[PDB]
Subunit: 238 residues, 4 copies
């Protein structure tokens, strides 16, 4: 069967033939590339941006905010019970693609916290990780497809040359090595927060295709046919 995917997308390229709004946008994706909720994103190609993502099983609202130094922020939210969508054990990761058009999909930092609180207090679990730059040989990441860490310590999700020039038709993903426990039958509340900073540079008039933070089944792998507009996440546009 296909993987089960929940994602927040920073979608730089409007694919209106598969339901994208006709502008760069942020979106919340629940098992489909066709986002349940979107907000218009005013990209600053060449500038370092920041994304903050949060979810709590009591509120049942997955939210995301994108900002840049000295600019107005873009926000997006969706009401959803993640226990009905995802398995109890997941992996978390970042993905990016290029297609006919291209961009650098550079990650400068990534942090993530999750918590599982139950009935009994001494029945609980937490996981936190934080990367400010990345090791050249990162043993706590599963790197998939074209993803790699360059000589500056930056995570490049898609291909770039030695001079830093991006390449088209590229796909890559980075997953945290340990599975994450996001629900159980006795749980009272589960929550997570994620942050990443990113640098999209591009020589193209319309940069493409984007970067996601995603949560999937533990054995998730890049699907066949998921390049370009499908963001390395989905086998089709349904």
């Amino acid at each position: 069967m296909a993987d089960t995917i929940v994602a927040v997308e920073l979608d730089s390229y409007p694919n209106t033939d598969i339901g994208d709004p006709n502008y760069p946008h942020i979106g919340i994706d629940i098992k489909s590339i066709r986002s349940k909720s979107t907000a218009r994103w005013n990209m600053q190609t060449g500038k370092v941006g920041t994304v903050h993502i949060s979810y709590n099983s009591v509120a049942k609202r997955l939210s995301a905010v994108v900002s840049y130094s000295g600019s107005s922020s873009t926000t997006v939210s969706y009401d959803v019970d993640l226990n009905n969508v995802l398995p109890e054990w997941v992996r978390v990761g970042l993905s990016a693609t290029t297609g006919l058009y291209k961009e650098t999909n550079t990650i400068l930092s990534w942090s993530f916290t999750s918590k599982l609180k139950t009935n009994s207090i001494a029945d609980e679990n937490s996981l936190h990780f934080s990367f400010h730059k990345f090791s050249q040989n990162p043993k706590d990441l599963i790197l998939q497809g074209d993803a790699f860490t360059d000589s500056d310590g930056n995570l490049q999700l898609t291909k770039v040359s030695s001079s830093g020039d991006p390449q088209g038709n590229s796909v890559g993903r980075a997953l945290f090595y340990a599975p994450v426990h996001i629900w159980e039958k006795s749980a009272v509340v589960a929550s997570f927060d994620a942050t990443f900073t990113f640098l999209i540079k591009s020589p193209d008039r319309e940069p493409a295709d984007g970067i996601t933070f995603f949560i999937a089944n533990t054995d998730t792998s890049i699907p066949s046919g998921s390049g370009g507009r499908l963001l390395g996440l989905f086998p089709d546009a349904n």
Copy 2:
């Protein structure tokens, strides 16, 4: 000039004359004792209970859950922008009352985290405290009214005897000593999370009146007339 109050109430006594539902309930109170959202609380007098509260400014949803070991939990949420309600600097606290009827309002643990973020993975401001014991001299709490720490290390918000028998017509509150910064001009996202565990015992067959977590202006005090049904928060029932 009255305080500005946001609270989560565990209201054990139905004051139907001032808009309570006719059962013990959990509520979200925005500037009034008359809750904007309530849910049925299945009290278990004599068992240790746990409350988890959370908010973030992108989701704009204040939510709370109450539970006991081996039991079903109760949730309540309300969509609100706290920027629009509270001043930028606050104190946070726990309050409790008894009236004609009575209960012990015993706090066994209390923790709190607030974050103010912008454009990096590290937060521009964060505060975290956690008490699992309470000290015989809590120099980091402002104790108001009948609130005191006992010989067992527990925090008693209202009057109780040597023998563990609660008293009627009591009011008590405990505030964390340092002001918390909950928004600013430059802010991208602000969030907070709080947890407390409580023991409510009663000789009566109808215990009263309840316990809250609340957030207020920094100079907040127990208002004249806030006994019983007003939970030590409000000077009247409007």
Copy 3:
């Protein structure tokens, strides 16, 4: 080549033939079962104990303390630079054995934090995990030898029957799934802290053999001949 091991041992059985003092002891082991430092441990068989372990690269002192409710604590320290000992990437874990004599090697909770700092604030890493009780399918743990999680949610490092009776000649370990990055060429300061709570029960007049927290090369596995007095860590007593 053999594994590289740094460990804190709760050594319940004196094997004076390989240099144990003639009493139960807590020990710091650096690449040998023969401890670099020991202290007398006053065991309370059948009671839940707590161990706290810490280290940072400026102080260069690895310390551990073992305690029980109502008792006084025993401490042990050793001055060592852990980088000259350990590789840059490690796994962290828990190990236990039994031999001719036996005990339960039960883990009720385990937490770990590591941090690696430079000065970019944006060149760095942290990892934190916390388990209060353990899942029936612990996908974030690598279980080795006889280790398993039971119906109560406890981690059993060595064999116990369904009635909870321990078995002799057992060895088991549990490793956190993700590698930990503990040094790099640009590092200024690296630190770690670990906590575990444990329950050692035994029908034997002299219980054996003990429990350790350990740090090893990422590919560590139970050496042949590490049963009993070698605590699942070393292939010989050198």
Copy 4:
């Protein structure tokens, strides 16, 4: 009665007068301006530096490292039992002075964590704060002497002009608002960690006088005569 002081000094100006070494140095001060331990400071006037300080009560080792974007590292350590020196409740803070000679004493960030542990994985008391910008009205800091926050959001501990030139004969301190519980009768282990980033700039051939992180009785205030060489911390040079 005088304040009770424990400090880590970054001392830019040798006062051989009162027992400084005859070079710029970092030091550990236990109840006297006359450091119990010093190290020659690998100083870089005009560069952003970072200080990390740590202590735990099992190891009994107070340690500090000062570095500059990864280079030019200096360390200092002292074996000491702080339960014998400090009261159980304290305030923590930063101080700085100029005298005949001068430098900017600029704080760009500051964080602190304190923990008091016993018999579990969850701590019985913890406190954590973090500032990466400082507020125009920082209600959670007690600002003493010349200390103010500037339009950039930096904390200036001593007088600086509107353009950016430091003034002589100035003193300033910033204390965190809430008292900190550092030890108790039945504590198993107490620990704290602090980090700050600073910028010392000077038009002088020989900058003065330095910056400290310190720990004091909760009621601490700038003593009379503690200018220049006494770092705003001590009334005399005894």
